[PDB]
Write an enzyme that holds these catalytic residues in place. Structure first.
Site, short mmCIF file in Angstrom:
data_model
loop_
_atom_site.label_atom_id
_atom_site.label_comp_id
_atom_site.label_asym_id
_atom_site.label_seq_id
_atom_site.Cartn_x
_atom_site.Cartn_y
_atom_site.Cartn_z
N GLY A 132 9.31 -3.88 -10.79
CA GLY A 132 8.15 -3.34 -11.48
C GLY A 132 7.73 -1.97 -10.95
O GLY A 132 8.45 -1.37 -10.14
N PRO A 133 6.60 -1.43 -11.43
CA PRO A 133 6.16 -0.12 -10.96
C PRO A 133 5.69 -0.21 -9.52
O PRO A 133 5.39 -1.29 -9.04
CB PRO A 133 5.02 0.21 -11.92
CG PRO A 133 4.46 -1.11 -12.24
CD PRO A 133 5.69 -1.96 -12.45
N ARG A 134 5.68 0.93 -8.85
CA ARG A 134 5.27 0.98 -7.45
C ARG A 134 3.74 1.04 -7.35
O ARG A 134 3.15 2.04 -6.91
CB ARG A 134 5.94 2.17 -6.75
CG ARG A 134 7.46 2.20 -6.95
CD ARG A 134 8.17 3.17 -6.01
NE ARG A 134 8.14 2.71 -4.62
CZ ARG A 134 9.17 2.16 -3.98
NH1 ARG A 134 10.34 1.98 -4.59
NH2 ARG A 134 9.02 1.77 -2.72
N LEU A 135 3.11 -0.07 -7.73
CA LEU A 135 1.65 -0.20 -7.74
C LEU A 135 1.25 -1.50 -7.04
O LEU A 135 1.99 -2.49 -7.08
CB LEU A 135 1.17 -0.27 -9.19
CG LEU A 135 0.28 0.84 -9.74
CD1 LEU A 135 0.50 2.14 -9.00
CD2 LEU A 135 0.54 0.99 -11.23
#
Length: 116
Positions: free
Chosen positions: A28-31
């Site tokens: 997934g996104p780096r969040l």
């Protein structure tokens, strides 16, 4: 009105796809987890209460709007070592008070027909 383009955006719940794949697929996104979740719930609440389960359905199984072009909207596909069945199981729980806790057409935060 619960169709892409109308009460539901075209290519619905972009952030929910990622939050579902982050959890299930691990990609997934780096969040930060809470950020990933928040963005997903935000997009979800922006959808009329009545169209909320339909939106989930579209994100999970996809949809094909009639028309000259008509491209497949949404749907969770298979990822390397992450079958579509795993992702679907979790995606179905998004409205739950456990997850986003949002009211659907029933007034209660649940979508009994979504999964399966």
């Amino acid at each position: 009105s619960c169709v892409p383009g109308w009460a539901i955006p075209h290519n619905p719940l972009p952030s929910c796809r990622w939050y579902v794949t982050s959890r299930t697929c691990g990609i997934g996104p780096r969040l930060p987890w809470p950020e990933l979740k928040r963005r997903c719930c935000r997009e979800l609440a922006d959808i009329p209460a009545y169209c909320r389960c339909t939106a989930l359905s579209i994100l999970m199984d996809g949809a094909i709007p009639p028309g000259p072009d008509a491209q497949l909207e949404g749907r969770l596909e298979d990822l390397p070592g992450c079958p579509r069945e795993v992702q679907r199981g979790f995606a179905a729980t998004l409205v739950t008070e456990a997850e986003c806790n949002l009211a659907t057409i029933s007034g209660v935060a649940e979508c009994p027909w979504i999964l399966g």
